[PDB]
């Protein structure tokens, strides 16, 4: 038996991953309840991950795979769920700190995500191209006055991820984005049939909300 396609919700500790699920829901294998909001209207599953670094590997593995399917346990009888998209959630308020530490740890996680998918696109011992799996970079907590707006978030990540691929090539496959690219932009990931877009929103409090996110996603699965 099979289930609705699922969207991998990944991001660092404290982004609001666990928070967003409940909203989604309230409207290693994975143990999701196939209930109401995803079922009744959203026709896909939102799959939560752990935030800690020690645990990122399992999340990353799914991303290497040319045709990723997730094994889910509803609330015995195991299912498979076609991985069709990814939501990269981060705390946009914590990003604002002058020290620049949040951006660094966060851009590192984000790097491996896009590069994993990048390897997955190239990797073809099966001769056909692998299916497009878009990543949505969701800048959460837009209700806080101190939260960084989505357009800055977009720009800040590119500069760090570009900084990352630069510092590593100076290690004289691990190169994110195009090989001839002079400065990094998410738009150049289109060359590997992966769509990456930064979008702001919030789960609790007063602001943009989360439906724009889901609308992006549902428009893409
Ligand atoms: N201000 C604000 N706080 C949020 C929002 N979403 C989540 N949080 C809080 O930020 C923290 C993030 O925690 P959590 O959901 O456990 O994130 P996780 O570590 O990634 O699983 C929690 O205390 C949430 O209550 C939001 O939209 N706005
Ligand atoms: Mg959590």
Short mmCIF file of C-alpha atoms and ligand atoms in Angstrom, two decimals:
data_model
loop_
_atom_site.label_atom_id
_atom_site.label_comp_id
_atom_site.label_asym_id
_atom_site.label_seq_id
_atom_site.Cartn_x
_atom_site.Cartn_y
_atom_site.Cartn_z
CA UNK A 1 0.00 0.00 0.00
CA UNK A 2 0.96 3.61 -0.68
CA UNK A 3 0.06 7.03 0.67
CA UNK A 4 -0.14 10.71 -0.23
CA UNK A 5 3.14 12.25 -1.36
CA UNK A 6 5.09 13.86 1.48
CA UNK A 7 7.08 17.06 1.93
CA UNK A 8 10.26 16.94 3.94
CA UNK A 9 10.28 19.65 6.55
CA UNK A 10 13.87 20.18 7.56
CA UNK A 11 15.76 22.87 9.40
CA UNK A 12 17.82 23.62 12.55
CA UNK A 13 16.66 23.31 16.15
CA UNK A 14 14.32 26.17 17.07
CA UNK A 15 13.06 27.08 13.60
CA UNK A 16 9.50 26.13 14.40
CA UNK A 17 9.44 22.78 12.63
CA UNK A 18 7.45 21.05 15.31
CA UNK A 19 5.22 24.13 15.63
CA UNK A 20 4.40 24.28 11.87
CA UNK A 21 3.38 20.65 11.76
CA UNK A 22 0.67 21.14 14.33
CA UNK A 23 -0.70 24.06 12.39
CA UNK A 24 -0.49 21.98 9.25
CA UNK A 25 -2.07 19.14 11.16
CA UNK A 26 -4.63 21.24 12.96
CA UNK A 27 -5.36 22.96 9.68
CA UNK A 28 14.70 5.42 10.60
CA UNK A 29 11.06 5.48 9.61
CA UNK A 30 8.55 8.23 10.38
CA UNK A 31 5.45 7.97 12.61
CA UNK A 32 2.83 10.42 11.28
CA UNK A 33 -0.93 10.33 11.91
CA UNK A 34 -2.81 10.35 8.54
CA UNK A 35 -5.46 12.69 10.09
CA UNK A 36 -7.78 15.57 9.09
CA UNK A 37 -6.00 18.64 7.76
CA UNK A 38 -3.45 16.88 5.57
CA UNK A 39 -6.03 14.31 4.54
CA UNK A 40 -9.19 16.38 4.26
CA UNK A 41 -7.84 19.27 2.24
CA UNK A 42 -4.11 19.34 1.76
CA UNK A 43 -3.78 15.95 0.00
CA UNK A 44 -0.15 15.64 1.15
CA UNK A 45 1.82 14.86 4.32
CA UNK A 46 4.17 17.16 6.17
CA UNK A 47 7.10 15.26 7.66
CA UNK A 48 8.99 16.59 10.66
CA UNK A 49 12.66 16.04 11.43
CA UNK A 50 15.02 16.49 14.44
CA UNK A 51 16.95 19.74 14.56
CA UNK A 52 20.29 18.58 15.95
CA UNK A 53 23.45 18.23 13.78
CA UNK A 54 24.15 14.62 14.96
CA UNK A 55 20.91 13.66 13.32
CA UNK A 56 21.05 15.42 9.97
CA UNK A 57 22.49 12.42 8.10
CA UNK A 58 19.23 10.44 7.92
CA UNK A 59 17.52 13.47 6.46
CA UNK A 60 20.35 13.93 4.02
CA UNK A 61 20.22 10.34 2.81
CA UNK A 62 16.71 10.70 1.51
CA UNK A 63 18.05 13.50 -0.68
CA UNK A 64 20.72 11.47 -2.47
CA UNK A 65 18.16 8.96 -3.70
CA UNK A 66 16.96 9.42 -7.34
CA UNK A 67 13.43 8.30 -6.46
CA UNK A 68 12.95 8.98 -2.76
CA UNK A 69 10.15 7.21 -0.91
CA UNK A 70 9.48 7.59 2.79
CA UNK A 71 8.43 4.80 5.06
CA UNK A 72 5.68 6.01 7.37
CA UNK A 73 3.85 4.50 10.42
CA UNK A 74 0.28 5.86 10.83
CA UNK A 75 -1.60 6.45 14.10
CA UNK A 76 2.51 -2.14 12.27
CA UNK A 77 1.42 -1.56 8.69
CA UNK A 78 4.28 0.23 6.89
CA UNK A 79 3.61 2.59 3.95
CA UNK A 80 5.64 4.37 1.27
CA UNK A 81 5.25 8.02 0.40
CA UNK A 82 6.66 9.63 -2.74
CA UNK A 83 8.96 12.46 -1.72
CA UNK A 84 7.88 15.26 -4.02
CA UNK A 85 9.08 18.41 -2.23
CA UNK A 86 11.10 19.92 0.63
CA UNK A 87 10.39 22.73 3.10
CA UNK A 88 13.48 24.38 4.60
CA UNK A 89 12.35 26.23 7.73
CA UNK A 90 14.48 28.73 9.63
CA UNK A 91 14.05 31.29 12.35
CA UNK A 92 14.25 34.68 10.64
CA UNK A 93 14.51 36.57 13.95
CA UNK A 94 17.58 34.70 15.19
CA UNK A 95 19.10 35.36 11.79
CA UNK A 96 19.17 39.08 12.55
CA UNK A 97 21.85 38.82 15.18
CA UNK A 98 24.88 40.88 14.39
CA UNK A 99 27.42 38.18 15.30
CA UNK A 100 26.40 36.26 12.16
CA UNK A 101 26.57 32.88 13.89
CA UNK A 102 23.01 31.79 13.12
CA UNK A 103 23.51 32.39 9.41
CA UNK A 104 26.62 30.25 9.37
CA UNK A 105 25.31 27.06 10.98
CA UNK A 106 22.07 27.51 9.07
CA UNK A 107 23.66 28.11 5.69
CA UNK A 108 25.73 24.95 6.29
CA UNK A 109 22.65 22.79 6.78
CA UNK A 110 21.08 24.43 3.74
CA UNK A 111 24.17 23.79 1.65
CA UNK A 112 24.09 20.04 2.12
CA UNK A 113 20.40 19.98 1.33
CA UNK A 114 20.75 21.64 -2.06
CA UNK A 115 23.98 19.86 -2.89
CA UNK A 116 22.49 16.48 -1.96
CA UNK A 117 19.72 17.18 -4.38
CA UNK A 118 22.37 18.40 -6.78
CA UNK A 119 24.21 15.10 -6.61
CA UNK A 120 20.89 13.35 -6.97
CA UNK A 121 20.18 15.11 -10.27
CA UNK A 122 23.57 14.34 -11.75
CA UNK A 123 23.72 10.82 -10.36
CA UNK A 124 22.19 8.78 -13.15
CA UNK A 125 23.08 5.12 -13.35
CA UNK A 126 19.43 4.96 -14.17
CA UNK A 127 19.49 6.73 -17.50
CA UNK A 128 16.40 8.93 -17.12
CA UNK A 129 16.53 12.22 -15.21
CA UNK A 130 15.27 12.16 -11.66
CA UNK A 131 11.96 13.90 -10.84
CA UNK A 132 11.99 17.56 -9.81
CA UNK A 133 11.83 18.04 -6.01
CA UNK A 134 11.59 21.76 -5.15
CA UNK A 135 12.85 23.21 -1.91
CA UNK A 136 10.96 25.99 -0.22
CA UNK A 137 13.12 28.14 2.08
CA UNK A 138 10.57 29.39 4.59
CA UNK A 139 11.63 32.32 6.68
CA UNK A 140 9.55 31.82 9.83
CA UNK A 141 8.61 34.10 12.73
CA UNK A 142 7.76 37.12 10.59
CA UNK A 143 5.45 38.33 13.39
CA UNK A 144 8.41 39.44 15.50
CA UNK A 145 9.41 43.01 14.84
CA UNK A 146 13.08 41.99 14.77
CA UNK A 147 12.55 39.28 12.13
CA UNK A 148 14.49 39.62 8.85
CA UNK A 149 12.23 40.16 5.79
CA UNK A 150 12.20 37.47 3.15
CA UNK A 151 14.18 39.46 0.58
CA UNK A 152 17.12 39.93 2.96
CA UNK A 153 16.98 36.29 4.04
CA UNK A 154 17.24 35.32 0.40
CA UNK A 155 20.26 37.52 -0.15
CA UNK A 156 22.01 36.62 3.09
CA UNK A 157 21.86 32.91 2.45
CA UNK A 158 23.23 33.19 -1.07
CA UNK A 159 26.19 35.14 0.13
CA UNK A 160 27.01 32.61 2.78
CA UNK A 161 26.37 29.57 0.63
CA UNK A 162 28.56 31.24 -2.00
CA UNK A 163 31.11 31.88 0.71
CA UNK A 164 30.90 28.24 1.67
CA UNK A 165 31.55 26.83 -1.80
CA UNK A 166 34.39 29.30 -2.21
CA UNK A 167 36.20 28.42 1.01
CA UNK A 168 35.90 24.71 0.30
CA UNK A 169 37.25 24.81 -3.27
CA UNK A 170 40.21 26.41 -1.56
CA UNK A 171 40.71 23.02 0.04
CA UNK A 172 43.96 22.42 -1.87
CA UNK A 173 32.80 16.54 -5.14
CA UNK A 174 31.48 19.26 -2.83
CA UNK A 175 30.59 22.26 -5.02
CA UNK A 176 27.09 23.71 -4.72
CA UNK A 177 25.56 25.36 -7.76
CA UNK A 178 27.07 25.92 -11.20
CA UNK A 179 30.82 25.43 -11.75
CA UNK A 180 31.41 28.58 -13.81
CA UNK A 181 29.31 30.80 -11.56
CA UNK A 182 31.01 33.95 -10.37
CA UNK A 183 28.59 34.74 -7.57
CA UNK A 184 25.90 32.40 -6.20
CA UNK A 185 22.19 32.85 -6.72
CA UNK A 186 19.43 30.33 -6.08
CA UNK A 187 18.18 30.89 -9.64
CA UNK A 188 21.19 29.04 -11.02
CA UNK A 189 19.91 25.87 -9.36
CA UNK A 190 17.38 25.84 -12.21
CA UNK A 191 20.13 24.28 -14.29
CA UNK A 192 19.57 21.05 -12.33
CA UNK A 193 15.72 21.12 -12.54
CA UNK A 194 15.43 22.12 -8.91
CA UNK A 195 13.38 25.13 -7.92
CA UNK A 196 14.46 26.97 -4.83
CA UNK A 197 12.49 29.98 -3.55
CA UNK A 198 12.62 32.01 -0.31
CA UNK A 199 9.29 32.92 1.25
CA UNK A 200 8.41 34.62 4.52
CA UNK A 201 5.63 33.72 6.93
CA UNK A 202 4.77 32.81 10.51
CA UNK A 203 3.08 30.12 12.53
CA UNK A 204 2.03 31.99 15.66
CA UNK A 205 1.30 35.66 16.21
CA UNK A 206 0.38 38.43 13.77
CA UNK A 207 1.70 38.29 10.24
CA UNK A 208 1.77 36.78 6.72
CA UNK A 209 0.65 33.35 7.90
CA UNK A 210 1.58 29.98 6.44
CA UNK A 211 -0.89 29.44 3.64
CA UNK A 212 1.33 31.09 1.06
CA UNK A 213 3.76 28.31 1.86
CA UNK A 214 1.32 25.48 1.45
CA UNK A 215 -0.03 27.11 -1.69
CA UNK A 216 3.54 27.10 -3.13
CA UNK A 217 3.89 23.50 -2.20
CA UNK A 218 0.53 22.23 -3.34
CA UNK A 219 1.07 24.09 -6.62
CA UNK A 220 4.22 21.98 -6.94
CA UNK A 221 3.12 18.44 -6.09
N1 LIG B 1 7.35 34.27 17.42
C1 LIG B 1 7.16 33.09 16.80
N2 LIG B 1 7.62 32.00 17.43
C2 LIG B 1 7.46 30.79 16.87
C3 LIG B 1 6.80 30.66 15.59
N3 LIG B 1 6.80 29.34 15.30
C4 LIG B 1 7.41 28.70 16.32
N4 LIG B 1 7.80 29.58 17.25
C5 LIG B 1 8.49 29.31 18.51
O1 LIG B 1 9.87 29.10 18.28
C6 LIG B 1 10.28 27.92 18.94
C7 LIG B 1 10.62 26.95 17.83
O2 LIG B 1 10.41 25.69 18.43
P1 LIG B 1 10.05 24.33 17.70
O3 LIG B 1 8.73 24.32 17.00
O4 LIG B 1 10.14 23.29 18.77
O5 LIG B 1 11.23 24.25 16.63
P2 LIG B 1 12.11 22.96 16.28
O6 LIG B 1 13.26 22.92 17.23
O7 LIG B 1 12.66 23.27 14.94
O8 LIG B 1 11.37 21.65 16.29
C8 LIG B 1 9.08 27.40 19.74
O9 LIG B 1 9.04 27.77 21.13
C9 LIG B 1 7.90 28.03 19.06
O10 LIG B 1 6.88 28.29 20.01
C10 LIG B 1 6.32 31.91 14.97
O11 LIG B 1 5.75 31.93 13.88
N5 LIG B 1 6.53 33.04 15.63
MG1 LIG B 2 11.31 19.70 16.74
#
